[PDB]
Amino acid sequence: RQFGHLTRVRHVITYSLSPFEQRAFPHYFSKGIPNVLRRTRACILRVAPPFVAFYLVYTWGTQEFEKSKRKNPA
Amino acid sequence: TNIRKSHPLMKIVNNAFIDLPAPSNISSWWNFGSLLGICLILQILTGLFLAMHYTSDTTTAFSSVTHICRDVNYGWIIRYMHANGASMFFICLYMHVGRGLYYGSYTFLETWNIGVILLLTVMATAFMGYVLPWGQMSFWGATVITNLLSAIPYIGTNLVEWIWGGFSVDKATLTRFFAFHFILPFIIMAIAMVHLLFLHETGSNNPTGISSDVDKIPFHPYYTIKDILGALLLILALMLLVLFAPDLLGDPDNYTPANPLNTPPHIKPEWYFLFAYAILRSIPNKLGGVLALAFSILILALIPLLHTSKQRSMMFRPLSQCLFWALVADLLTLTWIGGQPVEHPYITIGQLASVLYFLLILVLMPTAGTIENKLLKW
Amino acid sequence: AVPATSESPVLDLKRSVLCRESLRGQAAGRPLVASVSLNVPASVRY
Amino acid sequence: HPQDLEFTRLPNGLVIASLENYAPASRIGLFIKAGSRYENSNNLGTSHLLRLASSLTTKGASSFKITRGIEAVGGKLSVTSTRENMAYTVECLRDDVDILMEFLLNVTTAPEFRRWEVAALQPQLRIDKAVALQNPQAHVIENLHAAAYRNALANSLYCPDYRIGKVTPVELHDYVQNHFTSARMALIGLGVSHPVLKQVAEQFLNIRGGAKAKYHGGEIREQNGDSLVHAALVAESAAIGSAEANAFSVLQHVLGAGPHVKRGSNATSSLYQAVAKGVHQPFDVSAFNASYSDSGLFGFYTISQAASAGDVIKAAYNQVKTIAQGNLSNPDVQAAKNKLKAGYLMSVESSEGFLDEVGSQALAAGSYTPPSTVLQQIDAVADADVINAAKKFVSGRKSMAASGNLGHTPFIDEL
Amino acid sequence: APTLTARLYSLLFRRTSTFALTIVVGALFFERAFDQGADAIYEHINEGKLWKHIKHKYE
Amino acid sequence: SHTDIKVPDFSDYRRPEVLDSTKSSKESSEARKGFSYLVTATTTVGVAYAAKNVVSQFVSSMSASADVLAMSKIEIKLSDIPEGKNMAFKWRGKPLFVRHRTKKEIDQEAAVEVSQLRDPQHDLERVKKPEWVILIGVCTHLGCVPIANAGDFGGYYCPCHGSHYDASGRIRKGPAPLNLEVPSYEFTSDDMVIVG
Amino acid sequence: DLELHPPSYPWSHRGLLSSLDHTSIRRGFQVYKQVCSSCHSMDYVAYRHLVGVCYTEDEAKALAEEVEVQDGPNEDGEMFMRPGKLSDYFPKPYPNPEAARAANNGALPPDLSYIVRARHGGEDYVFSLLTGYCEPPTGVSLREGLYFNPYFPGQAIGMAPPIYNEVLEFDDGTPATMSQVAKDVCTFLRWAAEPEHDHRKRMGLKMLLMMGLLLPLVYAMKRHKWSVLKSRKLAYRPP
Amino acid sequence: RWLEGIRKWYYNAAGFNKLGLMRDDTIHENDDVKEAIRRLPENLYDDRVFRIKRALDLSMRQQILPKEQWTKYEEDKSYLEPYLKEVIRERKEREEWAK
Amino acid sequence: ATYAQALQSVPETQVSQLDNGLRVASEQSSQPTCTVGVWIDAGSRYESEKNNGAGYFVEHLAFKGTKNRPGNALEKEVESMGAHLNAYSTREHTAYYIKALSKDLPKAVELLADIVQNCSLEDSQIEKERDVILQELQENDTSMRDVVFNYLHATAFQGTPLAQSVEGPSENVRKLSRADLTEYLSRHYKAPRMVLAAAGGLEHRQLLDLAQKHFSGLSGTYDEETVPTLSPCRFTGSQICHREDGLPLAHVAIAVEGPGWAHPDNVALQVANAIIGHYDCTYGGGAHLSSPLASIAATNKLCQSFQTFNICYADTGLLGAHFVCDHMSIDDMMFVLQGQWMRLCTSATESEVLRGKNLLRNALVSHLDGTTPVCEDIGRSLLTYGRRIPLAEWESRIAEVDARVVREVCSKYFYDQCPAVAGFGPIEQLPDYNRIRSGMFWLRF
Amino acid sequence: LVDPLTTVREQCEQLEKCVKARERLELCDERVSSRSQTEEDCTEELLDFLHARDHCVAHKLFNSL
Ligand SMILES: COc1ccc2c(=O)c(C)c(-c3cncc(-c4ccc(OC(F)(F)F)cc4)c3)[nH]c2c1
């Protein structure tokens, strides 16, 4: 479906500037850094805990394989 | 009126690549489609240029691949571009599928199923590609994996010897593996066009899982400029491997020629199969192991039926998000475990991981959807 | 050569009238005339 | 060299009139007795198609050349229809008059009306009419005439819907061949010499020749659910050229014939104040005066809210009754004359409107009456003549037309 | 006096013919500059290790 | 009313040059375009540098590999072949005849009839030094290896069909169309020759 | 079956942009020549490969001429032996693997062309192997011929300690200690397995710089085009 | 009753409210929902259109609204329920009749 | 009697000035009717945000009485002498004029003077005309043309007084007291900002003396603090899209920054705009029209109507086009329109520029027909240019334009420049600003 | 001729991690060499020692080359 046949919209105004009138990086660090920390804080304890568990099951299983190959004092 | 909408060839290009209405809000996870296309073209070129110097005879094969890397001008950079390009393909593929799972793009059933076929074909291609150098892991990998089909009752043993064209992986096997490996990418090319042909019936999903018809932007320039940037970052990843770590994702044992006596210590496929290799080894019975390895990929075709949430994307769905990232972490565990020897504690961890894989897809993520619904009074 | 006071389109919604001050001048006083051209928009007069 | 109008009537009937004023621009108008009135029930809307049909291919010039050639030199070709006349008009800078004149003669004296071009043009009848009928004055005035007459003036300027797609090439040829003739034509000019116009008219406009309007009195009522009701009520008036017609024109300006001040309350308009006394919600009223060769219509046009249409029309009609009964002072009739006198001179102020009056007169009368003589004829209208015009309207058989939600619009016999 | 970017626009970037010629010229000048400059950085980083640096000992 | 609509303030987003609402942006328009198109132009020069190198390498691949260039040329020692005798060599999977020619063989092949030959070539343009003639030992008609110091014309003779070559390698009497082929070569130091 | 993996020695080519020490390669070749080449083959390296790396054209021609090699047939139909040239590969010790086993008590000496690439640890591994030979610990003994090396898998190898102090004199007069001889031969075996190394890293540098330039430029082009949408303000104005 | 504490928590965790969306804006459009949407009155439809457009625009920038402007849990009107309920109730009637 | 000659003997425009600074300008001819009026450098551009729409509010009150003629006395006197009284307000120019019998010019000038200077502005009359303006503001919402042009200005000259509408926001209309209106008047209605223009049958000498008699009291001094100078207005490359699918046809208005009144380039730009020209669905020409945009539009039924404009303000303006089309035609209209701008920039021909010249020659010679448009040309030209420019001078500027000029002049304003876009209605198809902006250049020239 | 290797191997041998591992090595040396008939050996203890030793050797052997 081409533009002109997508959907019905009414009473919605959109203002915008030319890209030659404006900056590529407005407040890039000023507002970017806090928005990143907000986004990171928001997803951290959905994303991270499984990978912490992988790190633990990995480092546990690796050095358990090393101990198992050593002799037992008997 | 213009000669972009009028001319039969430009019409197709204008509607599928320029004036294509795309959602305003699609994220970086939507770039992997175009990057898979770039990977496919990249493999075909590098591949074709390698095929100008390679030979599929068992005696000369390993030597031809080294002759490429030593004597052919820039044959090394082509060779290792092609090998790491296969890794870049699979990275791109799993990211692309994960996007589909998380954001529920799989509701586009036809697009999704053709996807599954594409995945399976790129696997078949890359399995047979790794055999062509005719090193140890090539030869021994091909031997063990092919011979899994002997586990089928009645016919299995015949089937395996018919693939081989003989009683082991030898002269007739390598030559046909070169022929099939050449033709399949072109078949992928065609199936990928059918893939998009279905995608353009619905247009793209977006991160919200909510219809974007009220906020469509033309593909050009917005996503043509993003795809350039994406391609640039794909080439960085590729060339970082080719120029600073060409052997990192391969194996040393594929630099000794194939020896039918001398077995390598811990024979394994390339990193992107290790998850499914681990699932195979979890199950003690061999036929059961093959049916689990088969179901570990084909379960992708089941995913759409298992959808229970009244919301499409996982964006607004915390339980599912966690279970999804558990499923990813589990696959990372299966890849780790797949690369290990069959011993304690890698057997038990592998079993536990393999149960968790199927448990997450068939039981927990469906339940989570229904719980989320009842939390919203739905 | 000169464009008309009003560009004419078909199927375009009419301009509403909400007061005396805009409605005066409309009451017809003389019989109709119809002009058509090459360059100027078509008009209908009182 | 200050210049005045020249005038000629050839023995074949055709009138040439031309003021050489040495302006940069040159207006030429070929006026023809070929308005909608000369249609019958078999070829209705033929003159409408004919009006749209200039710039179709002619014998001496293609459809392409008429458009491109005229545009090339910055020019204009217009075609204007009343009920009684058609007027083909060309403008340009004075150096390109003989190029435009050649096109004008081709259009009027030798059109081909090719089957494929004529057929291709049929949808334009629908578009042109559709546009025109956006103005509700067009509905009402076209219906008013249709109600008021049995035959010629009843005809609409626009082609009836059923005829659209069915006006034939033969009908267009017939219409031109029977109406575009020397005895029915006047060639008017500004910024061109009279002798060269005369010689064009002798050499290219000598072409051989080819019923009275019965007043009826009726009503037509367009029910359409608008919140405003347009309505016109008229009676048979007087033929243009007669002295009685001047009395109606003065009565028109006594009663009120459209606005003088922007956003003004119309303090001198007798109708507007008569209506505004009773009803203060949005409305408009004006005296309506059409005047033709055979006949005329005089009355008034209301625009009112649906519910108040009854009150507005009766109020307006009552105002004419007091004028007809004798309530009419000199200061009103003097003011009304000053309006009419000023309006006429202002209408011929531009060289567009001047051309229209020169050609208009040339068909309906023998020759040109100058502005000073017209103003003297307005002054000749006595207060007695105005009261007679009003009296004629009150006792005259009425014609009416309305459009809107007519639930409270009265019929003629409710008035 | 107009700014540097403005001089670049009016002289080189406005006509697409000059814009293209500019890129092709710039690419030649860039190629040799970048190659020569990057090779210097490489060979300084590996001073005395390359055949180029030890060539003179056997000629 | 639509007159109530007022366009939002874009000051946070605007470029410095167009912040001042009381000044004309036309001064800065030349500049603002310049900046953005410089970025585009610089990018294209970078991509050109890349694509040139990428394409050029791929093209280089198809040109002769290092092992094929290794067999391209062959060194021959001129003091190891005595005056009169032929010496055969292996060159690009072919025989390669080098021949030290005597005072007699030089002068006898110098004053030969130019027209009588089937392939007219004079001797001083078939060789670079008069006393050395280097030839491919492939008989031109249907491919054999000619035997040295034999034939009627005292040079090379083939027992396959019936060809007779002179001491300069030119066909004299037989079915061969072309003469024996003169390869590309150059003498380095006076004792050595590289063919190829 | 315990395992001791090698430590990471600070090689002169360890870093991202660090090239091979070509003087170390020149020594390392001589350690293959003088010591290994009677036991190990190195089939993929020819005498021409040395040119423009560790030796000149003329030096490499001398090294090639020193060795015997079979060629044929001649017109008689016989296989003769001739002095080598640049086109010849490094000559195999034995005619075949079965012959090689007999000369080394069953064990086959692997080809060294790719041994750095074909073993985990690479040059770190080989250096540790060559210098790590020691007397066995108490409770241990292997078959007569299998020596003890702590870095070899399974703790026992069938190679006699090949290097020691002054096992050869180097052409540039470097004191040939066991550690020096191992370091040099490893540097050569690194190059043997990966000739591209130096070009590869030169390319790496040029890629890193081009990306340092293009990524932020293309990212700026992206932000420029997208600034129309990122700035935009929306308003809902229902009647 | 007792799980109303968890419902309130989950609502904010889900976080569609941070884009000024109501729950019924996030519902996945199947054929029933499409029909239910199609039956909305001018006002409810155009508000839906805007709310989504605003969310999509926020999503594009990877930003959220100010906390004042977030959809309150209590004020989340279930605007689509009565239309969707009947669309489904209708379909099940046809499906019954078809057997 | 040729065209070049005709221009030489067109009546000259007389020019005199009063002590206070009021300019009296006159074109005379033996005509029984005349038009006379006052043109003022006043409008929305001179208004701040807190008093926007004051000049429009005044316009409503101007003809509703004076101190000398209270209420409908002013109205009655105009009507009873057959005179026609009229006003208009633009962003830079307010104007009141009267069409009258030539013999009644003294009274005409007297009445104009009474309106301007002694305007009643009654309490009750203000509160009545308050609701009237609110209903006009509502009528104006139904005119998509009016709305889209107000939007073009609003976005084009955003954050300046040129962004403001003439009528003002309804908030101001509802609150403006009579104190605001009288303050607005005494600041802006000053003799040096004003012109008394007249055309028809009238001796210039008599008009000057009539101006003395009635407009002498007009103030033409400014106090030490403040004097109404217009600041320049920043054009912004911007877009405003009011999406409303419930309407049947889409209005689009697009333009680049024009040069403004004084600049000679305006003549070449008029010629270029004449080439592209204008069209609507009632035009007889269709496919055979000379303008490629019009012939393409007609044959493919792209739009219902379009015109090119060139709107001039002091140090800036709006140069472009407006069109009205089907919701599926907006992309194609824009493509062909922008395509014409590029073709004129890069590759305009001599014969088509000759056509454009001839159109423009005809345009402004036939526009000055009747006393009212001539009076208006006198009034405004004195404000914009500082003088009336005779037809002979326009002709000289027009003959100077050849194909090379049209290229160079169009390339200055159109080629690779950021436009302002306004769309209203079913504008889903309306191209993205980047696609519009990229359509302001060709990858060839 | 003295090898830089054997010098540094001694230097590294006298660190806490080496000498503690060397005592572990010597413990089982005179446990298995004193006891009769047990198939236990001392490979593990040697490898613990070498891992710690040769890690240190690596850190500064290449200085002398
Ligand atoms: C929602 O986004 C969509 C929608 C539809 C499509 C679609 O139909 C197709 C065919 C692709 C696609 C597939 N393969 C390769 C490319 C490609 C090739 C070269 C490029 O140039 C560059 F790398 F920049 F140099 C850039 C992209 C694009 N991508 C899509 C993305």
Author numbering:
A (entry chain G): 2 to 75
B (entry chain C): 2 to 379
C (entry chain I): 33 to 78
D (entry chain B): 20 to 229, 235 to 439
E (entry chain J): 2 to 60
F (entry chain E): 1 to 196
G (entry chain D): 2 to 240
H (entry chain F): 11 to 109
The publication says:
1 is the central component of the mitochondrial electron-transfer chain which is responsible for the electron flow from ubiquinol to cytochrome c. This occurs via the oxidation of ubiquinol and the reduction of ubiquinone in a process called the Q cycle. Ubiquinol is oxidized to ubiquinone in the oxidative (Qo) site, with two protons released into the intermembrane space, while ubiquinone binds to the reductive (Qi) site, where it is reduced to ubiquinol and takes two protons from the matrix. This process allows proton translocation from the matrix space to the intermembrane space, thus increasing the electrochemical gradient across the membrane.
The resulting structure showed clear and continuous density for most of the protein. Interestingly, Ser35, which forms a hydrogen bond to the quinolone molecule, is replaced by a bulky Phe residue that would form a steric clash with SCR0911 in the parasite enzyme if the binding modes were the same.
